[PDB]
Design an enzyme around this catalytic site. Structure first.
Site, short mmCIF file in Angstrom:
data_model
loop_
_atom_site.label_atom_id
_atom_site.label_comp_id
_atom_site.label_asym_id
_atom_site.label_seq_id
_atom_site.Cartn_x
_atom_site.Cartn_y
_atom_site.Cartn_z
N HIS A 129 0.82 -1.20 0.00
CA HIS A 129 0.00 0.00 0.00
C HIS A 129 0.86 1.25 0.00
CE1 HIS A 129 -3.78 2.16 0.67
NE2 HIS A 129 -3.06 2.97 1.43
N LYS A 185 -18.33 13.17 9.89
CA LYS A 185 -18.54 13.11 8.45
C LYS A 185 -19.47 14.20 7.95
CE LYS A 185 -19.44 9.12 6.34
NZ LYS A 185 -18.46 9.07 5.21
N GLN A 189 -5.76 13.45 3.78
CA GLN A 189 -4.88 13.19 4.90
C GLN A 189 -3.56 13.90 4.67
OE1 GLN A 189 -4.55 9.13 6.06
NE2 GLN A 189 -6.77 8.84 6.20
#
EC number: 2.4.1.255
Lengths: 1017, 1017
Positions: free
Chosen positions: B486, B886, B827
């Site tokens: 990843h 959210k 991020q």
């Protein structure tokens, strides 16, 4: 009121309530001012000692009978100085209160502060006498007595303390210090370890354990003890030095570098770390910093000896002699015991040449330190240089007895052994050193030469190839070669190499002579005041009993005084030889030089002598001083009648040779010029000293009808005077190849006297067979060659002509009467495996053949014997005699059949001997002058067929002769026929041509022209 | 006659004159047969003990009252065995002569020869009680008591002996043995050194000093003590073992090899040297001899544990597991305390997978040896494998507390820190390990990723180039790369490298699955019994509250049951999310697997389910089990809606993409095939969960006349139901680029509600300014976005639709009202210096510009701040908010002006958020699928101009927009206008095309044809 909670505030450490309540007490019950002196105790802690004096004044005023006021008075007085008065009232105290405790203690504290140890000790001991429980006062007698020096009385005070209070961790560490002083470490590090186990926040034990663990050369544990020591105090600056030393000794250099930086950072004034840091750098390459650091160190103190030594050494690697000299002087005079400085100073003195004082330095260096092998080795070098003390050999031996790990020392003593004649010891020592030193070339070279002496040809070509590499490599390193210049002509090397080594040694000699700066001589061009007579000079460390003398002895006898004057110069001290007797007998000017160690005045003496022509005999040999020629005093200096191979001096002028021995082809490898003889440069001498062998006589053989000259013969100065005494014997005209011309003379020396069975002759035969000393018939002393020395040694020493009649026998040396005798007499070492194969082939191809040798030295007989059958020969086909003095040495050759040459390098004198004896000789020219020598004599004799051109030719000639016995007979003939008619002996003519050649040389020099190859005189 | 010169001959040691004279005595004075027993003493020495019995018989017969006859009788009887009878008359002796000396001595000699120690001790002590001078009997009580075990009573017998005869050199060495037993070495080596100084030809002291010096780990002195020990006895064969061990420990291996050969030569039966020699070889390379030597050792004894361990280890380097297993079993059962075997066995058990028993092995290994850090580290690896014990983290910490020299252990605990969220600790630990381990690559890689999390770009390109080298080098070493699959798409690497790493991990997974040899499934070609309905399978460890779920949640809602049946498979345990509630609400078949740790029965269950199409969500992420797909149960397995970058599994079948995002050019780096969408593979989800934002409302700005939508707005599910309540507010037709067509609708969502100064609106403005919780007017709860979670968290968690009316303010986050807002929300770690230069340029070229960020994580704010002014920006031009859940996370974007993309790798979901919010978005395609994502959404929206082609284009577009405020207004327009009409939300259509594509895929497979790039469906 009356209540000690004020004293309890003292227990807390305050005074406020105590001082106010005691103030109330004074204002109500003025009787305890002693509590005010307790307040004064606070005052001692809080510097209010003035009020302490105040309170004491109050107490003494009201209560003049309490010691304690005087005690506090003493404390403040010690602060204020009056310590003797403090003692005054302390001793005034302890009177009314004889059992007071603290008075004794602080009294001793006072006296020890005054330097009166003795009284202090009694003070403590009194205190103990009252109370045996002060487990922390004993340790103070420890600290005291151990300071006084009465160690063994101290160690009994600690021990009582320890057993009193076994947790006490300051009476273990001190006790450790005592055992460390008496010398027994294995208990000292014990007691310290107990005293950190009991108290792991204690610093002195950690250091002291570090120190005594780096004396016993434990290291890892020393590192741990230090590391903890500083993690209790991280900037100590004295730990940081030792820790570096331990790191440096483990091999972890970089940590030493860093820590030394840290130490000098923490404390700047610190000479020792500077010096030691300098060593640390110097072993790491950065020498420049090392010199600077040493500078700094001696800056902080000009007396620190270690730095002086080390810096002086550093300079001495740059040849800066006097600087190091004076510096070593300074260090030694500061520290008159420092052996290392002694050694270094003496070695540089060895460089200075002056050595007797260097010798005493070596002596004293050993004297102070009796375990310094290095100095032994060096002083041995010194002694061997100045004389030949074999006690110096013992000095080497002492060095091994101290440490047998010295390859170099073994090499030394082996050198002494080789010089002396102790060959096996030298062999063993060289092998020892080589097995200890794989890399050492010089040992390899000398060992190689020794092996070549002893004929052990194991790994033969391998040895030559390796050493050829070594000499090439060494020469490129711009150093003098290990191989001695004389030894070269044994190994096969290029002409370039041999030359180069010659110039290496020659330039070495002139290197010594150059530094003296002796003024040059304005000698040249002196032929007018000379009045037409020239001056010739000869030098020799071998005037006397030596082959060279045995060869040139008669030359001064017929020198022309008209145009030449001769000067003799005996380098060696006289030994009263009849040779030397003749030397100054016919000398125009005999001059001794053994009284002259001075090179200068000797060369100057030559300069006043103004000798036009100077001639050398020695060259590089044992016992010569060529520097005398290196200064080139005389205008012309020449090599002659010495070992072949020009010195490469570049100040030598003329070799001597003929047209053929040294043709112009090889003129590339000789530094100096050439001079040609009509026939040869090697002049005979025997006819002068042994003209008695001009005639011979031979007895009848076992068989008759055939001629056998070479089994048993007769000689004697009066053999002809004995022939007439014979009733009737046969005189056959022994013939060389003649054909009937020139043989019709009186033929006194051309008719072989063969005595058949004759009654007197037969009788003397039997009286000789049994080994009888000698017999005398008809007034003639009949003798055998073997006992001529017993009859008169002088007759055989060559100096004296024999008188009797001499007989010799083949079986007198055990020689069978009908074997083809092939022989030689050269020294043993001039033989290799390859030529040994050559004799192997020839000896095999003749059945009744014998090879004659000499056991010279005898240690080689087993080794040659091995290879004799290794190529398949019996141990009876070769016979080797012992060494015989000169006269019979040359005589016993007459019994032999045919001698053979050594192709590696010919026998310079021996071949002349056998040629004079009339026995034939055969050789093949090599390629060096030494090798080319042998054919020279034959060419002068004009017998060309006796010369080969290839090794096969040598074998074929030997076979052809050995088979053709008749031609061998006439070969011995024509050698005998020529030797009387040969030009090899007209010493008159030899001197004639020699002087004439000098005059040609000098007349060319009168033109001032440069020396050149004066061919065709 | 009566005369002891016979006894003097005994003193000499002969008997002849003595025996004859005593024979004369017997024949004259038969009273001394005791002299005949002295003769019998000669007999004892000369085995004539029969005549000793004879003489004793005579003596007892004539003289039945002399013990000495019985004494000699006892001596011979002990020779002959009757030792109890020897004691019989010895105790019969000592009766008439109670003070006899030698009787006590040899009596004790007798009893000790019988095993009755106790009596012997009393015998000696009696002897001493008579005589205190036997300085050589005390030492025998020493030798006895120390054997009994009463050590501290022994050490009082030696000491008396020593002080009696201080030269005695056998009462020092024994006393050394006592101190060696009590444990205090520093005295033991002392006493031994005294006892070789007194007697340097004594052997036992030399050995014992060797032994106790190689325990204290002094070495050089141990070598010297041995070397002398054998030069007193050169073939000892026990010295020769220890001497090897010391050589091996100094580091001089070859001497150890040689000496071990010498030892085995001297004595053949010697297992220990065999084993130790094997170790010596094994560390030198010749492993083959090592195995053979171990064989020999266990041949001589099959129980020698050390060899068992070492040989088993040697085999285990050749994977020969069971051999080592049983062998370790054998060693452990022989020696139930051997910690090293425990460790080795447990580690191979870790290889075996079974670990709980390996865990108890690690436990017990520590239990026996509490100072074994290695086992701590390994057991920590075990625990972390089997659960996530942070006590295991403590186990690591314990390892450091034992030894902080473990870079690897620090790396471990840092890994735990990174997993947990303890970023700074991980950073510190990785730096620690790297500073201790320069060579460690894995620490470098993880540390690199951590730094990239924390934006510290020191030495940025340097780090990438070095690690690019490391990954290339590692991959050539045929090992799994350190870089996680990843993490790759952060570093810039070649397509080949990224692929290769993907296959490395994929083949790793199939490597685990292969060894199980589970039978293959005969699943395929099931479409007939399927009756025309297909089966689709989804797996996810993220069914629940997770962005993936937040994205795909509604897909099962409109799946066609006619030709497809859906099966859900929640890998993770349930957490009661309303998401999951819906998941099984509309699931055709919901299946849990958290109850199934078995890979087998799970895969089998799939096999019975016979699912035609199997689709993955996880791929290589945190918390997934891909091996379930590695067994390929279902006929077709696909990647979809997961991280980009194909796994390289080679058993994956179809990626999902569109025509443009993944064109055929890059198809070289994807192991498996392609599937094309009409528009894009990334499907929207927000409209399902947040259709309330379909309409908005905006309050009036500080200024009037101009339109300001993006400062303070109004939203709410009932905002339209609130509009009618308004008396009179302005409703302006906000326009995208229109021109007058299609804007003439009702325009409910196309007319911006701008509320001017209105009394109720103004009032609620002030009651919101002060931070009041919320107010309620006209039955409508008026709320701010910031406190919606406090009002009801469920409304903001997305699972529950909000009810109230929501207002938001720029200054509610401190945002100035008239600054150009450039922003993003991805991020933090997906930012590099280079793109930071890009924002630097654009932000500089606009005066009233602000960059909006998030402190996610907050530890990066200082580091970005540094570079903000390093390229010269103020600390007020950039504003960063905190993390918001959210709903308000997506809402607070509406206040911003223009978001900006991160070119390194786009925000997969976040870009969708801002697009749904109606704010514009701009990006430049990279070259990886991840990078290419961002343009996909825009292309689906059909706004091509918002896409750049070069970095300069990106800057120019940003400048052009930021300057052109009017066009920005209509940009927000057309984004809003398209978002309602966009195909990005027709989930009906998305499922339609999706299912149709499945059926095309399955119909191609019905032909059995190989998978291929199914372009143009």
């Amino acid at each position: 009121g009356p209540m000690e909670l004020a004293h309890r505030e003292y227990q807390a450490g305050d005074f406020e309530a105590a001082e106010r309540h005691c103030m109330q007490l004074w204002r109500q019950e003025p009787d305890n001012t002693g509590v005010l002196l307790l307040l004064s105790s606070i005052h001692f802690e809080c510097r209010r000692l003035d009020r302490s004096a105040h309170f004491s004044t109050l107490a003494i005023k009201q209560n003049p009978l309490l010691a304690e006021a005087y005690s506090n008075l003493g404390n403040v007085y010690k602060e204020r100085g009056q310590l003797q008065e403090a003692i005054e009232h302390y001793r005034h105290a302890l009177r009314l209160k004889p059992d007071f405790i603290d008075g004794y203690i602080n009294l001793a504290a006072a006296l020890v502060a005054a330097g009166d140890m003795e009284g202090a000790v009694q003070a403590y001991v009194s205190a103990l006498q009252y109370n045996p429980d002060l487990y922390c006062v004993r340790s103070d007698l420890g600290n005291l007595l151990k300071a006084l020096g009465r160690l063994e009385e101290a160690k009994a005070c600690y021990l009582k303390a320890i057993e009193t209070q076994p947790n006490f961790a300051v009476a273990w560490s001190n006790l450790g210090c005592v055992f460390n002083a008496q010398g027994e470490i294995w208990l000292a590090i014990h007691h310290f370890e107990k005293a950190v186990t009991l108290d792991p926040n204690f610093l002195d034990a950690y250091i002291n354990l570090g120190n005594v663990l780096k004396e016993a050369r434990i290291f890892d544990r020393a590192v741990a003890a230090y590391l903890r020591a500083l993690s209790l105090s991280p900037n100590h600056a004295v730990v940081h030095g030792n820790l570096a030393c331990v790191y440096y000794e483990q091999g972890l250099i970089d940590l030493a570098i860093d820590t030394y930086r840290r130490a000098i950072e923490l404390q700047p004034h610190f000479p020792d770390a500077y010096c030691n840091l300098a060593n640390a750098l110097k072993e790491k390459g950065s020498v420049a910093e090392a010199e600077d650091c040493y500078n700094t160190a001696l800056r902080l103190c000009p007396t620190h000896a270690d730095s002086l030594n080390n810096l002086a050494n550093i300079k001495r690697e740059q040849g800066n002699i006097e600087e190091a000299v004076r510096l070593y002087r300074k260090a030694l005079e500061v520290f008159p015991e420092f052996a290392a400085a002694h050694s270094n100073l003496a070695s540089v003195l060895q460089q200075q040449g002056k050595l007797q004082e260097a010798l005493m330095h070596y002596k004293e260096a050993i004297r102070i330190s009796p375990t310094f092998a290095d100095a032994y080795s060096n002083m041995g070098n010194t002694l061997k240089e100045m004389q030949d003390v074999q006690g110096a050999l013992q000095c080497y031996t002492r060095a091994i007895q101290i440490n047998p790990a010295f390859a170099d020392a073994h090499s030394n003593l082996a050198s002494i052994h080789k010089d002396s004649g102790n060959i096996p010891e030298a062999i063993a020592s060289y092998r020892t050193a080589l097995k200890l030193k794989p890399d050492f070339p010089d040992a390899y070279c000398n060992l190689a030469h020794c092996l070549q002496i002893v004929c052990d040809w194991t790994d033969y070509d391998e040895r030559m190839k390796k050493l050829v590499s070594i000499v090439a490599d060494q020469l490129e390193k711009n150093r003098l070669p290990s191989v001695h210049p004389h030894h070269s002509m044994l190994y096969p090397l290029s002409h370039g190499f041999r030359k180069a080594i010659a110039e290496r040694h020659g330039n070495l000699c002139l290197d010594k002579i150059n530094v003296l700066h002796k003024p040059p001589y304005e000698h040249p061009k002196d032929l007018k005041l000379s009045d037409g007579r020239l001056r010739v000079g000869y030098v020799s460390s071998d005037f006397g009993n030596h082959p060279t003398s045995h060869l040139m002895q008669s030359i001064p006898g017929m020198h022309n005084p008209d145009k030449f004057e001769v000067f003799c110069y005996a380098l060696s001290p006289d030994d009263g030889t009849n040779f030397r007797v003749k030397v100054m007998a016919e000398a125009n000017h005999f001059i001794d030089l053994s009284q002259i160690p001075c090179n200068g005045k000797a060369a100057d003496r030559i300069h006043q002598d103004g000798i036009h022509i100077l001639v050398n005999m020695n060259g590089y040999t044992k016992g010569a001083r060529n520097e005398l020629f290196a200064l080139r005093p005389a205008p012309i200096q020449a090599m002659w009648l010495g070992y072949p191979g020009t010195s490469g001096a570049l100040f030598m002028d003329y070799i001597i040779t003929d047209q053929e021995t040294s043709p112009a082809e090889v003129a590339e490898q000789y530094s100096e010029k050439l001079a040609y003889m009509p026939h040869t440069f090697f002049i005979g001498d025997h006819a002068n000293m042994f003209p008695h062998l001009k005639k011979k006589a031979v007895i009848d053989f076992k068989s008759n009808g055939h001629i056998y000259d070479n089994r048993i013969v007769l000689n004697g100065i009066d053999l002809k005077a004995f022939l007439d005494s014979l009733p009737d014997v046969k005189i056959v005209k022994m013939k060389c190849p003649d054909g009937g011309d020139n043989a019709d003379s009186s033929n006194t020396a051309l008719n072989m006297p063969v005595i058949p069975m004759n009654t007197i002759a037969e009788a003397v035969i039997e009286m000789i067979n049994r080994g009888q000393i000698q017999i005398t018939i008809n007034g003639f002393s009949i003798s055998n060659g073997l006992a001529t020395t017993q009859i008169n040694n002088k007759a055989a020493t060559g100096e004296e002509v024999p008188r009797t009649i001499i007989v010799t026998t083949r079986s007198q040396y055990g020689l069978p009467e009908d074997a083809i005798v092939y022989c030689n007499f050269n020294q043993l070492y001039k033989i290799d495996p390859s030529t040994l194969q050559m004799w192997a082939n020839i000896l095999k191809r003749v059945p009744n053949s014998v090879l004659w040798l000499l056991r010279f030295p005898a240690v080689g007989e087993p080794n040659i014997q091995q290879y004799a059958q290794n190529m398949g020969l019996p141990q009876n086909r070769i016979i080797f005699s012992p060494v015989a003095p000169k006269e019979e040495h040359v005589r016993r050759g007459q019994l032999a059949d045919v001698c053979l040459d050594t192709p590696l390098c010919n026998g310079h004198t021996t071949g002349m001997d056998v040629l004079w004896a009339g026995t034939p000789m055969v050789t093949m020219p090599g390629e060096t002058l030494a090798s080319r020598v042998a054919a020279s004599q034959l060419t002068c004799l004009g017998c060309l067929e006796l010369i080969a051109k290839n090794r096969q030719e040598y074998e074929d000639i030997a076979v052809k002769l050995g088979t053709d016995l008749e031609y061998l007979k006439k070969v011995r003939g024509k050698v005998w026929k020529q030797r009387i008619s040969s030009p090899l002996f007209n010493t008159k003519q030899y001197t004639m041509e020699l002087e004439r050649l000098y005059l040609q040389m000098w007349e060319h020099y009168a033109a001032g022209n440069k020396p050149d190859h004066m061919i065709k005189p």
